[PDB]
Curated annotation (Swiss-Prot):
The chain holds residues 538 to 608 of 626 of the full protein. Component of the CFIA complex, which is composed of RNA14, RNA15, PCF11 and CLP1. Interacts with RNA14, RNA15 and RTT103. Interacts directly with the phosphorylated CTD domain of RPB1/RNA polymerase II. It is found in: Nucleus. Present with 2800 molecules/cell in log phase SD medium. It comes from Saccharomyces cerevisiae (strain ATCC 204508 / S288c) (Baker's yeast). This is Protein PCF11. Component of the cleavage factor IA (CFIA) complex, which is involved in the endonucleolytic cleavage during polyadenylation-dependent pre-mRNA 3'-end formation and cooperates with cleavage factor NAB4/CFIB and the cleavage and polyadenylation factor (CPF) complex. Independently involved in RNA polymerase II transcript termination. Binds RNA. Seems to bridge RNA polymerase II and the native transcript and may be involved in dismantling the RNA polymerase II elongation complex.
């Protein structure tokens, strides 16, 4: 019984991630090569900017956070 944290495991917390879409972006979109699916930006009224929901950037490539989490090679 958390005060403000969810007890529903880390499974939801991967999908809750986002990254800000710049005004220089090509139509606010990119494609996930893992599942072959296109992400689109969504407006944020507080900052006055846009955000890519469930999205991650790494080494010049774009992916879904839930997709890339399955392929994250790590040990060091
Ligand atoms: Zn994907």
């Amino acid at each position: 019984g958390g005060s403000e944290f969810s007890d529903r495991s880390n499974e939801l917390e991967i999908r809750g991630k986002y990254v800000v879409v710049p005004e220089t972006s090509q139509d606010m979109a990119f494609k996930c090569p893992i599942c072959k699916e296109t992400v689109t930006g969504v407006y944020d009224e507080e900052s006055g900017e846009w955000v890519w929901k469930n999205t991650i950037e790494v080494n010049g490539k774009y992916f879904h956070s839930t997709c890339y989490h399955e392929t994250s090679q790590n040990s060091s």
